[PDB]
Amino acid sequence: MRILVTNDDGIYSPGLWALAEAASQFGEVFVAAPDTTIAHPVRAYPHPSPAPHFPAYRVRGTPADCVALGLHLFGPVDLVLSGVNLGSNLGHEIWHSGTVAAAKQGYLFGLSAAAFSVPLNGEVPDFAGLRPWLLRTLETLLRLERPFLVNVNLPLRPKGFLWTRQSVRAYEGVVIPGEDPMGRPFYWFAPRPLKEAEEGTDRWAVAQGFVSATPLRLDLTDETRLQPTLAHD
Amino acid sequence: MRILVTNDDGIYSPGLWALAEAASQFGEVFVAAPDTTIAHPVRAYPHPSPLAPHFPAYRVRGTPADCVALGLHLFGPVDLVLSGVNLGSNLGHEIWHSGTVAAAKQGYLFGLSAAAFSVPLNGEVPDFAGLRPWLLRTLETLLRLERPFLVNVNLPLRPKGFLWTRQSVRAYEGVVIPGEDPMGRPFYWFAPRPLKEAEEGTDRWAVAQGFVSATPLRLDLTDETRLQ
Amino acid sequence: MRILVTNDDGIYSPGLWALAEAASQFGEVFVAAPDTETIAHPVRAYPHPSPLHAPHFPAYRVRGTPADCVALGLHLFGPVDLVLSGVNLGSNLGHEIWHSGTVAAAKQGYLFGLSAAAFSVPLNGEVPDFAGLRPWLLRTLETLLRLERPFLVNVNLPLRPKGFLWTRQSVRAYEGVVIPGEDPMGRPFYWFAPRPLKEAEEGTDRWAVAQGFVSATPLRLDLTDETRL
Amino acid sequence: MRILVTNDDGIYSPGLWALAEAASQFGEVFVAAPDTITIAHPVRAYPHPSPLHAPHFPAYRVRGTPADCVALGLHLFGPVDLVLSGVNLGSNLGHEIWHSGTVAAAKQGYLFGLSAAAFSVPLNGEVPDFAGLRPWLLRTLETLLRLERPFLVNVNLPLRPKGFLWTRQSVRAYEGVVIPGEDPMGRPFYWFAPRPLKEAEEGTDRWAVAQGFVSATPLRLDLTDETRL
Amino acid sequence: MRILVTNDDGIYSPGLWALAEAASQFGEVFVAAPDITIAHPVRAYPHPSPPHFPAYRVRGTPADCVALGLHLFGPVDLVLSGVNLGSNLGHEIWHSGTVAAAKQGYLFGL
Questions:
Q1: What structural domains and CATH numbers belong to chain C?
Q2: B221 in contact with C, Cβ within 8 Å
Q3: Is A122 in the D-facing interface, judged by CB distances under 8 Å?
């Protein structure tokens, strides 16, 4: 099988190259990464892979742009992988994730897809010690009914793997006033969750030391509110 | 009832004032809007509501989410968070990265009822003197629902109805066509297009039929049918 | 003559309309601003209903940068004599002139061979009154239409101008102030609060505005320092 | 002498590390580059281990702008005698100098007193061979270290250099070419394709790199056009 | 495409799997089989299918299985009911539970 690897941090992110080297254990691997709805032009320049040579392209566009060009230039492609993003993509963060959107674009194009992320701020992800678990994870996804759309968060030092649901929490909008060093006022926006992540959620799983894998949906409709509204006698 | 009003087009967008005006008809309106992820600092300066009655307002040099948190601290408590009226649609796959929708969701995450308002664009501009009747009718409907609620609303340019809808979810084809600019440089045309037409009952379908579209949104992106 | 007016705040900026209105009092205006707020690239525009009817002039919102506006403007209303850019809601003084979008549109004008002027009014805290500034804008636009053309000026008008003043760019030195801190959550960070060593000195644009005088600084394109060459 | 190095492509660009290594041949090098305003703003910074195989470099990745890096670095490392910025992937010639992030960081170095330079290399197409360019960065740095301090220079190295040259910025007039066109869907749009009236002169930075010579241009901060003042 | 398969004989009928298996030869299959219009409680239970198509045993009627089938598995493009051990011809069509399930499917838009 053939795999397209992209991300949203750039063609130089070591997480991009760690994902591609790991994807290569299961198939032909091709890379298309970002430079940084309507028909637009996209410039794509061949990029030499800094490991087993991977045909790569540097795209002047969005990650979704990469997936589309990556399928054109490298088709056929059976799977679309996005990451590994330097930074988590858990709970409410899934919504806005660029990494996730890349995988979602692949699913919308009919392929199977998965986003991979690791937490930042402090220690940098050690990709050598993460290779085993990256591999294990890929081996599992590859045993799912296709196509699939999955969101993966790997902790810094994984001890396991778990299928998770998204953490969904309420917050109290904390606004704390303050003044900068030179006198100018401002507001410190810092929302705190009203409770701890329940077990079974992606956030929990990563805090316990497990690779979290969440199957995503494309439909945002709240049918439990819609259906009753649409009913008649 | 106290209503916080915001958007993502800017304190200067007419869409924003059309909505605050319409919301006033149901309660005391407060406005907080963007100027143009974790504990971060944000600035906010008073702003005179355009002249229409006066609305306490603020321009926030941050995100629509910041506006919502900043509005609840500056005019709290609040009963409802309305975001829009956005100058561009927010149907289907677009809901995902909607700034307008982002603001409303923020209010929801704070225990409040919320709704985003969008009017389709890229051609002509909306007439908010004509849209007002449909806006009022829509708010009136929303306010009868059980609280809290999270609804996404799209209004066609000149509406002739109203439908509770579901999100249009469609598959695509990665149309990539080679080409060069009249100057000589090569490039790739990316033109994604849906494998089919929007279905009856979806938001996209409703709007194309001249109807206002109202979709109740879920916060959980988890696909439970692939988890169990 | 014919005058193309743009800005970088967007087609709904009160400052854009104040400048077109203030311009139409010296010629035919044509607006082309970004609705969005260097190799052949697609650019589209849409007729936009201008809010000015005294007189009414053709407008366009462009899905592109301020520079795209200038270009599309010149092809849509060509030929044009003067390119105006502003009024920016915010100042564009001193080091700010470097990465200023407002100034950039005017600059793009000059390279297309026209005369150009960026206008800006300080903000932060209070909003300008374009009603009261109209006198000074007009007086300011007379002064520029006199100048040997082509020209490229950067105008800055205080909130309440009490005079004019041809000026020079303030070129101060700073010390990089950095203080450790920690957001409410206990997280550490650093405040990077740069502050100039001395005050603006007379003749400088920043000084002019502090005095209540409209500042207008002619600009040079060549950043080359011929002395050390 | 101590040297601070940064860029705008990020802490992972291999150009940041080639410049840093070339710098190390002249003194102690410290790095602060983006993980990826004038009012006091918060800036995060985290220690970042240098390359696995090469001299050890004390470095920091910062969640801020290149200018922020110059400031945080000076606070975390500095005293520093020189601020280097690059090697930027892509060039920074003629008009580009204004809206260049690379030049920007250097510029910030200057405003702080310290001497500084920016290095850029033409990209798009074939990537640069930093091992083949090392001899030229070393050659270039030797020359800049002779100039009287403080100084501020912009350097562009072609892919395969064959000389050096002290240039002046390549200024040129452009024409707003606007070809009408349509995409596949059938949608209409305007192709804005800016094009210079005449090839860059000589002794200009753009001209040199075209011949194959490294270019270095000393820069000014003052944008005022005195002759009209 | 995706397919929902049920019957009115129960989850152990060979007919049901002989149908699910033939159904999988054209798309993703999901099986929901048995154990009024007013709102009634329905329980389904994860059931191991004997290829491998996800399945459920539903403590409910066949209709219930199509309803539940879609909510726990759906969306879906087609409903299949059977194979029923026993014919459903002529006058018999009127009261067939096998046909009633496909009917519940059509009335649902599939």
A1: 1-229 (3.40.1210.10)
A2: no
A3: yes
